[PDB]
Design a protein around this ligand. Structure first.
Ligand SMILES: Nc1nc2c(ncn2[C@@H]2O[C@H](COP(=O)(O)OP(=O)(O)O)[C@@H](O)[C@H]2O)c(=O)[nH]1
Ligand SMILES: Nc1nc2c(ncn2[C@@H]2O[C@H](COP(=O)(O)OP(=O)(O)O)[C@@H](O)[C@H]2O)c(=O)[nH]1
Lengths: 177, 178
C-alpha cells in the first residue's frame, strides 16, 4: 500500500525528490510522509531522523537561506504553497552556489531531502502555508547561532524569487548587509 | 535561541493517554515549533518500540473519521492547520473507563499533541473549512492496515460521544460500522 518514488535531482548531486502515493477521494487525502523502513536509507548509517518541525507562515514571507554542517532535512508543504529553493552551500562541490526550485503545493505532495551544508529557503505564495520538515543529525540540535546564513537575494546565488519585497526576519535581513 | 520545550500531562480521566504541549516562537511572519524529538518524547512508548511512521490527513469541513484502533500501535496526533474535535475512546476491555471518551479541540491556538496507546479508538471531526491532521505511529513489525484494525461507529450509543453534528461526512468504512 505505502509507496515512495525517489529521484535524485538533475542539478544538485545528493538532493532527492521523494513523491509519496496517497488515497484520494472527495472527502480529502491520506498519505504517509515518512517511514523508517523506506526512507532511513537516504541518510548514512548511524544518523536518524529524530526531530519533526512545523513553520506556519503568511503570504509573502521568505525564510532563508539557512544551513549547518551536520543536519539532513526532509522538507515539504502540507497546506498552501511554497517556492522551496535548495542552494548548494558545499564549498567542495562543482555546483557550489547553484540552486533548484520546487513549487510545492499541498495538493501535489513532494518532499525534498537536503544533505548537510545546504542552504534551505522558502517563499510563501499562498495566503497561509504550513511547512513540515524532519531533521536527521547526531548529537545536539544546531540552533540559530550554530547555523550559517546566506542572503535571500545574494547576487552570487541569483535565485529567481516571485518578488523583490518579501517579509523577512531580522536575521534574514542582517545577511543582506 | 529559544529552547525546545514540551509540557507533558497525563489525562485526568483516561489512564495512559497523554497531552503534550510544545512551546512556539511567534512573530509577525507566523510561527515555528517542534512537534517531536526522540530525546524528549520516545519515553512515552515502552522500550523497543519506536516512532517510525509519519502520516497526514487533509480533510474538509464536516468530515468525521473514526473510530479506529488496533492491538499494537501507539499514536501521537495533532492538527497543524485548521481545527479538529479530536476524540479518544478507551477501547481496552480490562479498563475501568472502557468506552468512555475524551475530547480535545485542537488548532494552532491550542497546539496539543495527544498520545494514544494501543487498543484505543482514534477519531476526529473537522470544524474548520480545511484541516491538516498530523500523526506519528509507533509499533513493532508490520503496519496494521484497515483489515487488521477495529472500527466502532462514530455515533455508537454505548460510547455516546458528543459531536457537533448528527450528519457528518463519512467514509464507507465508517458508515458500515453503523
Ligand atoms: N498510500 C497510502 N494509502 C493509505 C494510507 N493510509 C490509508 N490509506 C488507504 O486509504 C484507504 C481507505 O482507508 P479506510 O477507509 O480507513 O479503510 P478501508 O475502506 O477498509 O480500506 C485504504 O485502502 C488504505 O490503504 C497511507 O498512508 N498511504
Ligand atoms: N520554541 C521554539 N523556538 C524555535 C524553534 N525553532 C526555532 N526557534 C526559534 O525561533 C527564533 C527565530 O528564528 P530566526 O528569525 O530564523 O532566527 P533569529 O532571528 O536569529 O532568532 C529563534 O530564537 C529560534 O531559537 C522551535 O522548534 N521551537
Amino acid at each position: 500500500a505505502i509507496e515512495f518514488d525517489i529521484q535524485e535531482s538533475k542539478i544538485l548531486k545528493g538532493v532527492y525528490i521523494i513523491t509519496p502515493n496517497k488515497f484520494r477521494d472527495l472527502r480529502g487525502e491520506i498519505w504517509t510522509a515518512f517511514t523508517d523502513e523506506y526512507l532511513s536509507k537516504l541518510v548514512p548509517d548511524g544518523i536518524k531522523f529524530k526531530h519533526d518541525k512545523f513553520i506556519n507562515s503568511h503570504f509573502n514571507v521568505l525564510r532563508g537561506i539557512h544551513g549547518d554542517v551536520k543536519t539532513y532535512k526532509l522538507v515539504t508543504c502540507v497546506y498552501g504553497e511554497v517556492h522551496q529553493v535548495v542552494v548548494d552551500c558545499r564549498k567542495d562541490s562543482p555546483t557550489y552556489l547553484k540552486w533548484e526550485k520546487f513549487i510545492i503545493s499541498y495538493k501535489n505532495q513532494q518532499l525534498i531531502l537536503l544533505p548537510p551544508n545546504m542552504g534551505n529557503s522558502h517563499y510563501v505564495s499562498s495566503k497561509e502555508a504550513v511547512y513540515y520538515y524532519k531533521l536527521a543529525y547526531e548529537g545536539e540540535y544546531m540552533d540559530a547561532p550554530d547555523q550559517f546564513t546566506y542572503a535571500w537575494n545574494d547576487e552570487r546565488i541569483g535565485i529567481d524569487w516571485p518578488t523583490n519585497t518579501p517579509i523577512l526576519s531580522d536575521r534574514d535581513i542582517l545577511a543582506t548587509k
